[PDB]
Every structure is written in structure tokens, then in C-alpha cells.
Write a protein that holds these residues in place. Sequence first.
Motif, PDB file in Angstrom:
ATOM      1  N   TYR A  81      59.968   7.061-121.089  1.00 20.69           N
ATOM      2  CA  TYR A  81      61.406   6.875-120.849  1.00 20.69           C
ATOM      3  C   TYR A  81      62.009   6.101-122.003  1.00 20.69           C
ATOM      4  O   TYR A  81      61.270   5.584-122.868  1.00 20.69           O
ATOM      5  CB  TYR A  81      61.653   6.076-119.566  1.00 20.69           C
ATOM      6  CG  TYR A  81      61.442   6.882-118.285  1.00 20.69           C
ATOM      7  CD1 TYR A  81      62.537   7.401-117.606  1.00 20.69           C
ATOM      8  CD2 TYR A  81      60.164   7.119-117.741  1.00 20.69           C
ATOM      9  CE1 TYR A  81      62.389   8.126-116.426  1.00 20.69           C
ATOM     10  CE2 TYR A  81      60.011   7.837-116.531  1.00 20.69           C
ATOM     11  CZ  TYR A  81      61.154   8.355-115.898  1.00 20.69           C
ATOM     12  OH  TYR A  81      61.088   9.092-114.741  1.00 20.69           O
ATOM     13  N   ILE A 105      63.202   7.505-109.425  1.00 20.29           N
ATOM     14  CA  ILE A 105      62.746   8.343-110.528  1.00 20.29           C
ATOM     15  C   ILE A 105      61.242   8.685-110.519  1.00 20.29           C
ATOM     16  O   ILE A 105      60.840   9.735-111.074  1.00 20.29           O
ATOM     17  CB  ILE A 105      63.172   7.803-111.908  1.00 20.29           C
ATOM     18  CG1 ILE A 105      62.637   6.409-112.174  1.00 20.29           C
ATOM     19  CG2 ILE A 105      64.672   7.946-112.032  1.00 20.29           C
ATOM     20  CD1 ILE A 105      62.835   5.918-113.639  1.00 20.29           C
ATOM     21  N   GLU A 106      60.436   7.842-109.908  1.00 18.66           N
ATOM     22  CA  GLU A 106      58.979   8.097-109.808  1.00 18.66           C
ATOM     23  C   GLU A 106      58.459   7.517-108.504  1.00 18.66           C
ATOM     24  O   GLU A 106      58.899   6.421-108.097  1.00 18.66           O
ATOM     25  CB  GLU A 106      58.205   7.448-110.965  1.00 18.66           C
ATOM     26  CG  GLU A 106      58.601   7.875-112.356  1.00 18.66           C
ATOM     27  CD  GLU A 106      58.242   9.347-112.679  1.00 18.66           C
ATOM     28  OE1 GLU A 106      57.552  10.082-111.862  1.00 18.66           O
ATOM     29  OE2 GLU A 106      58.655   9.738-113.771  1.00 18.66           O
ATOM     30  N   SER A 124      63.420   3.137-122.066  1.00 18.32           N
ATOM     31  CA  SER A 124      63.186   1.685-122.021  1.00 18.32           C
ATOM     32  C   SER A 124      61.721   1.354-121.760  1.00 18.32           C
ATOM     33  O   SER A 124      61.316   0.220-121.957  1.00 18.32           O
ATOM     34  CB  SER A 124      64.004   1.007-120.923  1.00 18.32           C
ATOM     35  OG  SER A 124      63.764   1.523-119.578  1.00 18.32           O
ATOM     36  N   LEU A 125      60.947   2.334-121.338  1.00 21.28           N
ATOM     37  CA  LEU A 125      59.521   2.051-120.986  1.00 21.28           C
ATOM     38  C   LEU A 125      58.695   3.274-120.914  1.00 21.28           C
ATOM     39  O   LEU A 125      59.208   4.362-121.032  1.00 21.28           O
ATOM     40  CB  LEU A 125      59.440   1.290-119.689  1.00 21.28           C
ATOM     41  CG  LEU A 125      59.977   1.879-118.395  1.00 21.28           C
ATOM     42  CD1 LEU A 125      59.067   2.962-117.847  1.00 21.28           C
ATOM     43  CD2 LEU A 125      60.010   0.683-117.385  1.00 21.28           C
ATOM     44  N   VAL A 129      65.282  -0.065-115.328  1.00 20.81           N
ATOM     45  CA  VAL A 129      64.288   0.503-114.441  1.00 20.81           C
ATOM     46  C   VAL A 129      63.523  -0.626-113.858  1.00 20.81           C
ATOM     47  O   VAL A 129      63.170  -1.626-114.571  1.00 20.81           O
ATOM     48  CB  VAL A 129      63.410   1.529-115.209  1.00 20.81           C
ATOM     49  CG1 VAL A 129      62.317   2.031-114.394  1.00 20.81           C
ATOM     50  CG2 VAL A 129      64.247   2.696-115.663  1.00 20.81           C
ATOM     51  N   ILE A 140      59.415   3.586-108.495  1.00 18.71           N
ATOM     52  CA  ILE A 140      60.263   3.201-109.632  1.00 18.71           C
ATOM     53  C   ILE A 140      61.688   3.665-109.432  1.00 18.71           C
ATOM     54  O   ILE A 140      61.935   4.826-109.150  1.00 18.71           O
ATOM     55  CB  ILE A 140      59.654   3.717-110.952  1.00 18.71           C
ATOM     56  CG1 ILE A 140      58.224   3.182-111.056  1.00 18.71           C
ATOM     57  CG2 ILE A 140      60.474   3.235-112.163  1.00 18.71           C
ATOM     58  CD1 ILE A 140      57.513   3.480-112.364  1.00 18.71           C
TER      59      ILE A 140
END
Lengths: 84, 89
Positions: B49, A41-42, B51-52, A65, A49
Motif C-alpha cells: 500500500y 481493506i483486509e 503507507s505500508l 491505515v 485492517i
Amino acid sequence: QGMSDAFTDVAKMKKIKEEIKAHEGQVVEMTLEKNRLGKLIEVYPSLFIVEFGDVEGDKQVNVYVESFTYSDILTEKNLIHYLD
Amino acid sequence: GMSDAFTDVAKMKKIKEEIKAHEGQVVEMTLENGRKRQKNRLGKLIEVYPSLFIVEFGDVEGDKQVNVYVESFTYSDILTEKNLIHYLD
């Protein structure tokens, strides 16, 4: 007779960073040396990530995550494969 | 007894709202320890996001650093006051 230039730390690390950057947004399979599929995702200069739990074929109750360093890959703590 | 403003549910809802509202903007953060705040840092709130959230440190004017790096935080980190955060205009 030893592994070629392809397998020096500097060569391998260069490849890992390149491969991770090139795959941003796509699915990866990862291990802990229990395999998991995740979405990349990143991607940043010092870390990347991955979101686990929501990839088709590896759906889980818990979607989470996790961050990894490039060293995690270089040291073979975690193995990674780039799915197309 | 502290009012319902300081219940976990109330505080969590506000934290999530405040982060969402501040995406793209500057935060000041420091680790909870003693009365005299140490090693405060400025960063840009670059991603939010469920969750974070993700902050980039080292490239905010007035707190520029040689090393620019990102770090992620959970909303629980803020709820439990492990990390303190302020939303700069």
C-alpha cells in the motif's frame, strides 16, 4: 436470569469473526470507547485492517491505515457497525 | 560524509521501489539490536500500500512455523532501521 447463549464470549467471538470476514471491502463505522468511517481493506485470521479518512461523509486530510485485533471488538474497546 | 545514496530521500525512494517490485515474493526480516542477528524470519510480501506493506510469516519453506500470522510495516520502519529487510530471489 442471565444473557442467553447468544452473549457468551465463544458465541460473540464467533459472530465477530464471521461478520468482519463477510464485510471485507465495505465500509464500517467504528468508535473508541470521535466516531470514524473506514474501509475494511483486509481481513486475516488474527487481525483486520481499516483505512480511515477517505470515506464519503467522513473525509479527512490524513488517510491512514490501522490494524485491529478481534479482541479489540470482543472487549468493547472499539465498537463496530457494518454499513451497507 | 555518506553520499547521496544514503540520504533519507534517496533511501525512501529505493525502499518503496524494492517493496513494490517484490510483491508476492519472499523477504527475510529481523529486528535491529546487536551484531549477531537474532530471530530472523521469512515471510511472503502479500500486500503493498502507499503507507505500508503486509507480510505473512510462518508458511515459507525452510521457515515454517506452527502459527502463520500477518504483520504490517511502514516504510518509515524500514527507513529508520527498526526492522531490517532483505528481498530473496
